[PDB]
């Protein structure tokens, strides 16, 4: 019965650490990889047209940046995603499928298909137990993309040049520039791959994802299962202020759902 509201406008930040290619070393003598770098992953979500009684469209801008740099520097990743979803089920109507940014109302202790926009497919978000988050009893879900349930790199996504985003899907450079073994001035072509793992903490009543943990791994390799050079390898978790903001938003949605449900009954 409940519907996703049309006034969603959120800005959520997840802090963590990464190993990443320094964008400013692109034309240097060697590709520079910075290790154990502090990062912040920011997600801006707003409602856009088409949105009506049946559907809601969300435009989501995601950026990853170094936090030991001022605002004009340390820019690592920047992605935009747009999805139209059913307001009652949160399922998608690039073509998306399943859940994308929210879980359904009255979320159950079961598996849900959860879209990964880089993999361009839904992967299972498996129920993993209950957990308290700031006084709210949440359901935990775990999703693996390119990793099998045992956490082993198994089917990482190979980037297409059409959807390579900010970095080339295929890169040719000297072994010396890549920093890998090779013959003198050997030329090596590597392809970029992607694998990720995420945990979601969900309010079962509103379906709001109040907290998330995300591990994203992008790397260059000649063979998918033998990574050679990291492009970005990050692990982030929703920060305390953003968790508080989502817990407050979920609580306000629960209060409105409760008011409407009680009015429909006696």
Author numbering: 36 to 128, 155 to 327
Study text:
NCgl2760, MSMEG_0317 and Rv0227c, which we collectively term LmcA, lack significant amino-acid sequence similarity to other proteins, making their function difficult to predict.
To gain insight into the structure of MSMEG_0317, we focused on the periplasmic domain and produced a truncated form that lacks the predicted signal peptide and transmembrane domain, referred to as MSMEG_0317Δ (residues 30–323), using a M. smegmatis expression system. The N-terminal region folds back and interacts with the C-terminal α-helix located just before the transmembrane domain to form a closed structure that resembles the shape of a ‘cone with a flake’, with the cone being the β-barrel core and the extended α-helix being the flake. Loop 9 in this conformation is stabilized by a number of van der Waals interactions, including those of Tyr224 in loop 9 with Gln181 in β7 and of Ala228 in loop 9 with Tyr292 in β14, and a hydrogen-bond interaction between the main chain of Asp229 in loop 9 and the hydroxyl group of Tyr281 in β12.
